[PDB]
Structure formats: C-alpha cells, structure tokens
Amino acid sequence: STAGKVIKCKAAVLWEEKKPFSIEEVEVAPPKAHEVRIKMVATGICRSDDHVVSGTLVTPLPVIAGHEAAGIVESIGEGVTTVRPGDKVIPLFTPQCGKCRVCKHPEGNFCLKNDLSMPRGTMQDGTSRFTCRGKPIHHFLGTSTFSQYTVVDEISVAKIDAASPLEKVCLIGCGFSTGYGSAVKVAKVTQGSTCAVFGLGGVGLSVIMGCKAAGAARIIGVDINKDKFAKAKEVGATECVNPQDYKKPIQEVLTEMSNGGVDFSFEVIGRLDTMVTALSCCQEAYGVSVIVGVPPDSQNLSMNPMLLLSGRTWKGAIFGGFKSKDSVPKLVADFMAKKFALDPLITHVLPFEKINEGFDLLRSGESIRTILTF
Amino acid sequence: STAGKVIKCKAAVLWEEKKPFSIEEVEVAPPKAHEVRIKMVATGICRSDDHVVSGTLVTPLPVIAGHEAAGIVESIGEGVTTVRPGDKVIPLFTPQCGKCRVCKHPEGNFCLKNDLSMPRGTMQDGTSRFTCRGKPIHHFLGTSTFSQYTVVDEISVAKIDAASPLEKVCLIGCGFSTGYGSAVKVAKVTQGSTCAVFGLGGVGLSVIMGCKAAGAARIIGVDINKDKFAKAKEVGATECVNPQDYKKPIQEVLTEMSNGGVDFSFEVIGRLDTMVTALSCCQEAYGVSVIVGVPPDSQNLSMNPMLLLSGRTWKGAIFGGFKSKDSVPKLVADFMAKKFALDPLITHVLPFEKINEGFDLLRSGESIRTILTF
Ligand SMILES: NC(=O)c1ccc[n+]([C@@H]2O[C@H](COP(=O)([O-])OP(=O)(O)OC[C@H]3O[C@@H](n4cnc5c(N)ncnc54)[C@H](O)[C@@H]3O)[C@@H](O)[C@H]2O)c1
Ligand SMILES: NC(=O)c1ccc[n+]([C@@H]2O[C@H](COP(=O)([O-])OP(=O)(O)OC[C@H]3O[C@@H](n4cnc5c(N)ncnc54)[C@H](O)[C@@H]3O)[C@@H](O)[C@H]2O)c1
Ligand SMILES: [Zn+2]
Ligand SMILES: [Zn+2]
Ligand SMILES: [Zn+2]
Ligand SMILES: [Zn+2]
C-alpha cells in the first residue's frame, strides 16, 4: 500500500432518488492539494442521508452519502500539518477554515467554504475523487463517508484521541454534537428551566442529554412513535407527550402542561408544522426555540410574527454551534472522562453490505442509530 | 378640585376606523382601587395609533388611543404606595406588576396582565372610565392618553423625577425606549459591529441612537422616504440606502455592501416582507434580526427556515426589553445626565385640538414625532 495510488474499494453509491443504495465498486483518487484520504472504520446512519434519498436535500446526483463517521488516516496530502497517517480522525460535517469571517467570530460555526448552502457535490478545488464505471460520483457535504475510503480536506477533518472506540465515537461527527451542542451552547439552557424536544431520534435524545447536562428541571419529549419514549426517559425526559393522543393542538397542551409555555424548546424533526408549533409553545416573553432539523427544500413557512414580537427568540444550529476542529477533539476527550453516556443512541450495529437494511430500520422507526462497521 | 369626582374634559375619541379623531367632551370617573388619575401634560403621536385608525391593531372601538405621554398625578386611588398626587409620571405601554412569571424572570418585560396579546380595551377590573354621550369608551392598552385627564393602574405608571421637561420626556414612554432598548438590550449590539435599520421614524432613529450608543462601526439606514435620511445621518447613520433606487432586491444589496450581511439588523417598519428581508440581510452564521414594528393582524409570513438554520437569530421586542417601572425612571434619570440627545426626534409641537393635523404629518411622512402639548 503506497501513498499515491488509486484504490479500488466498495461504496454505497446512490444513483437517483427513491432508490436503494447500490453498493458497488469505486476507484478512489489519492489526496490532491490539501486533502486527506481516510481508511474508514465505522459510519453512522443519519436521517440527513434519508433526506438525500427522499429528495428533501437537493444535492447533485449520483452521490456517495454519509457524514456521520470515524476512520483512520491512511494516506495524506502534500502540505497538510494537522494529521499524519495512522491516527484516528472524524470527518467534519461543517469545516473550520480558520481564515474566513465566521471562523474568527466568537460564536458561529457555519464556515463560508462548506457544501450545504450552495451544494456543489464536490471538493473545494472543484473536482471529485470517486469514479464508478468510468463516470464521476459526487461527494456529500465534503465528507461522503459511505465507502471504505473517503477523501476530505484538512479543514473538514478532526484529529481525535488515539484510544477512541470508533464504533461509538462516530456519533460525535454528526448527531450527538448537534443535539448536545444545540442544548448546551446554542440555546444555553439554564438550570431549573423547562425544556421541550420535538422528535426523539439520535439528535433529539442528544438534545435531552444536553438539557439534562445543563441541569433542566423538566424535559418534555414529544414524538408520534411512542416506543421511543421508552428510550427518552432513560436519558432525561421527565415527561413524555404524544401528539396523536390529544385532539387539542399540542401548542396548547405544552402551554397548559408547563404553566404558560416551556422555557426552551427544540425542533429536531425537520418539518415546518413542528417548527411553527415548537416556536409557539415557548414562553411569550422569554422563550427560546431552536430549529435543528433541516426542512424540505424550496418550501416556506406560515408564521404569525406576533409570536416573535412579544419576546420570543427563534434560533438555528448546524452542528450544534460547535466549531468542528476545535470542539470534536474536546468532545471525544470529554467522552474519555465519561461525561456523557453515548451507548443509548446506538441500537443496531450492521456491516456495510447490509446498508439498506439499516435505512429500513431508520424508515420504519425501529432504530435510533444504526452503526455501519466496516 | 377634589379627588373623587367625575371630571368633564376634552378627549380625542375614535369611534370607528378610517375616520378622524373626534375631539369631544368625555366624563372621567375617579380612580378606584390601585388606580391613578393623571393630569396629562404632553402626549406624543405614535404610529401604533395610526395602526388603530387604519385597522391593523384590532382593539374594541370606540377607543381613546395614545400611549406616548407624560403627565402629573392629580388624584390617587386607595392602596397606591408608589406615586402620590403632584409628582410627574409616565404612563406605561407595558406594565410591570412584579408578581407574574415574566416579571420575576431576569429578561422579559411582556407582563402577563397587559392588554395587547388579548386586547380587552379596559382595565383589570374589566371596567372602563371614559363615558362620552352616555356610552362607555374603551381604554387603549391600559394607557389611554388622548385626553386631558386619564386613568391608569399603579402597575402601569412610572414615577419620574420632578424636574423633567415633559414635552420631551414623553418620548421615553413608548418610542425612544423601544428603539434604544431594542438596540442596547434586546439585540445587545457589540462594539464595532455593523447594523442595519429598516425604517427611520421615531423608533428607527432611536434604534440608530442605540446602535451608536453601543459603539457600532457602520449603521445602515434603509427607508423609502429619502428626506428622513437627512435626519438619520445626524443621529448615527454612516450609510443610507433607498430600496427604490435599486432594481436589485435589497437583501443582496445589504449583503454586497456589508460583505456577507450585516451583524445586527432591525425591522421597525411593521410589515412582513421587510421582516423576512431584514432577517435575510443578516450574516448567515451570527446574524441577529430584531423585529420591532407590529404587523397587520392575523396575517402570516412566508419564510425559508434555512435562513434561521444556518445560524441566525430572530428576536422580537415590546418596549425594547425594558421592565417599565424599573427602566423608565432610570432612562429619564439618564436623560438628566444628557446621555442621549432627545431633540432630533421631535419635529412638530401642536396643541391637542389640532390632533388630526399631527396624524396627517404622520401619514404624509413629513414628521418624526408630533408632540401634543395641552
Ligand atoms: N442541524 C444539523 O446540523 C443536523 C444534524 C443532524 C441531523 N439533523 C436533522 O435532524 C432531523 C432528524 O434527525 P434524527 O437523527 O433526529 O432522526 P429521526 O428523524 O428518526 O427523529 C425524528 C423524530 O420526529 C418524529 N416525527 C415526525 N413527525 C412528527 C410529528 N408531527 N410530531 C412529533 N414527532 C414527529 C419521528 O418520530 C422521529 O422519531 C433530520 O432532518 C436531520 O437532517 C440536523
Ligand atoms: N415593538 C414596540 O413596542 C413598538 C413601539 C412603538 C412602535 N412600534 C411600531 O413601530 C412601527 C413604526 O414605528 P415608527 O414610530 O418609527 O413610525 P414611522 O411610520 O414614522 O416609521 C415607519 C417607517 O417605515 C418606512 N417604510 C414603509 N415601507 C417601507 C419599505 N418598503 N422600506 C423601507 N421603509 C419603509 C416608512 O418610510 C417610515 O419611515 C409601527 O408598526 C409601530 O407600531 C413598536
Ligand atoms: Zn447526520
Ligand atoms: Zn470557516
Ligand atoms: Zn408608541
Ligand atoms: Zn407582571
């Protein structure tokens, strides 16, 4: 195994929408200017990949999805100084350039050179690295980790502790940092406060873990699928409310149940109705609603601005407000100190060739996170 | 003059919408328990009164509007311990009871016993005091000051110092505290930041005064009426942009002028497309847009939630985040130290009987504030 050879490995190429991930053979180019090629170890299955295959994230197809992962650097670029081959890394959902306008600001992680505002499906030089049956396959958000080998940039890769169990640590890359960081850093949950969480996936259970870590008194988990409440109460949900039980709207349910509205509210579903709902179930004068789940594309809201004008605050968060190269090594380093229990997010551990199976476990609602070990 | 007699005095009663303020003879009942009856001195003309006569604030009419005022306590009710007859006070657009859930929160001024979320047009005993030709006339948000005498509550009145020129100090009651407080307290404008202000009335010029007072580098004033730019540059507007000059949409005008969007943005107009515009002209990762102007009633927005989801923050503010009985005496006390120059808001000083004239100066765009001295 040399450093500048093209690797024929296996990947899960998605060709067009509403079709299964075709696990096929791809050629992977060596690292060009300021790149890192990663032997991939464990890759989580996020709902954003289901947003790719369902069509609510418009990315240029054919694509290799996957952004929630950890791996080992196997070949290195020409001038990169952060990582060297052999050490465990996490591919970063949002890069940290260090030179841009956002990266020099005290708050703000959404770098200007990411791939989510205007998705090009490629790397920052303009050219892809995956070729499958002679045609190029697009990347996904600069990580594209549904393969045995991926190629990322230096600014979108994070060096983590060398003794990290990657099958669990791969959740720091997208899901847990989004939820936990959305609770403790974006919303800034104060002690004794009352929180509401809309959606109990890996992100929502991470929100409950963050609100419990910030010392919230009541944490209210709101979800249709009632089985997930049995998970939510073990990570901090003191109350659990199903919208399908109540013919009254759930705005007024969380209003009367939490004495006029919750203090902090979170929407991790990704639907517009629960965005407006999660805003309107806050307190009218000091409520903070954080949008976490991504909406379907080219679709707007219908929102009464008086809901904001009485005193609410309505934020958003990508990767939980965490500057990635700065916060991922200290979140894995804080996982070393057992600060958070990352085990209740993982429900299924499957090999890579069963990848569609994992997505069925994501689409039938029978799983929280399905880890793809390689 | 005694303390418990019904007083015939002149007022500007608005009977039904889209009609002039009929200045007629009203009777004012004496103040009941925990109420204050005020010799009114000077009453400013706000755009929210034009929102009453235009129909975008659904209140129960016939109503005596007007909330920007300063007066003298002339008779007192029982149980009132704060103010005593003879001292200058300011009626409060939003009360501060001190016992509610909002009034014990560190941030949040929107008290639960106000009259703006569910407007009843009366006081907390459910009973008005203005009778005109035998029929009762409704209050306006518990501070109905288009009359020579008025009756407010103890929770909705603020004792100011005895040496205050009320013809200028009456703008602390609604307008200036909304603008200045929206800049320095709700948005928390940091040192050297870049601000944008949509609308250059009394509230918008107060926003510019607050952003300059918090040390903003660039303050961009955006308004259709170009004459108002000649006022805005004397209170801090380093740049001034007209949307009517630019055939390109003003969102990417403010994005191109401020290199990716302004740091803080403010919408003090009170209309929906400028709210979505003022949100979208912030920075994608650390922008804060504050809604100030009240929208038309029961009309929603059409807003792309990705604008919030990249990292923006979208707030609102009634009375600029100021707890009223706590902040009005220290804002008049800070007017004593000449901390802010309140003269450039006042453009016209008219008597009360010319009140419709002042509203014409509000509706033709030829004035900033029209003070109604008695
Ligand atoms: N902002 C970010 O950076 C970021 C990062 C990761 C994921 N996400 C987004 O988070 C979203 C969900 O991710 P996930 O990990 O939580 O998986 P998930 O979709 O399985 O969890 C969402 C839950 O919402 C519930 N749901 C659907 N409709 C509902 C309704 N009316 N009321 C209540 N609940 C309802 C579902 O039961 C589901 O359990 C996705 O859209 C993903 O894109 C955002
Ligand atoms: N939140 C609060 O507590 C509070 C308090 C006082 C006033 N207000 C609201 O503030 C709003 C107006 O306040 P004001 O005192 O400045 O009155 P104003 O009418 O003098 O200011 C409005 C300005 O908006 C501008 N305008 C209209 N359309 C525009 C457009 N497309 N683009 C740019 N500018 C446009 C007008 O030129 C005007 O200068 C009102 O809705 C009023 O109710 C809110
Ligand atoms: Zn993910
Ligand atoms: Zn950056
Ligand atoms: Zn006003
Ligand atoms: Zn109160």
Numbering used by the authors:
A (entry chain A), B (entry chain B): 1 to 374
Which sentences did the original study use to describe this structure?
Here, we expand upon our previous results and show that biological specimens amassing <100 kDa can be resolved to better than 3 Å resolution using similar imaging approaches. The resulting reconstructions possess well-resolved density for bound cofactors, metal ligands, as well as ordered water molecules. We further demonstrate that conformational heterogeneity in specimens of this size range can be discerned. All specimens in this study were imaged using a base model (i.e., excluding imaging accessories such as a phase plate or energy filter) Talos Arctica TEM equipped with a K2 Summit DED operating in counting mode using the Leginon13 automated data collection software.
We first decided to target the 82 kDa homodimeric enzyme alcohol dehydrogenase (ADH), as the structure of this complex had been previously determined to near-atomic resolution (e.g., better than 1.3 Å resolution) by X-ray diffraction, providing an atomic model for validation of our results. We further purified commercially sourced horse liver ADH (Sigma Aldrich) to homogeneity and prepared grids of the frozen-hydrated specimen for cryo-EM data collection. Inspection of the map revealed side-chain density for most of the ADH polypeptide with pronounced backbone features for the entire macromolecule. Moreover, there is unambiguous density for the bound NADH cofactor, a catalytic zinc ion within the active site of each protomer, as well as a structural zinc ion coordinated by four cysteine residues. Furthermore, our ability to confidently identify bound ligands and cofactors within our ADH EM density effectively demonstrates the utility of conventional SPA methods for structure-based drug design and other small-molecule research involving similarly sized specimens.
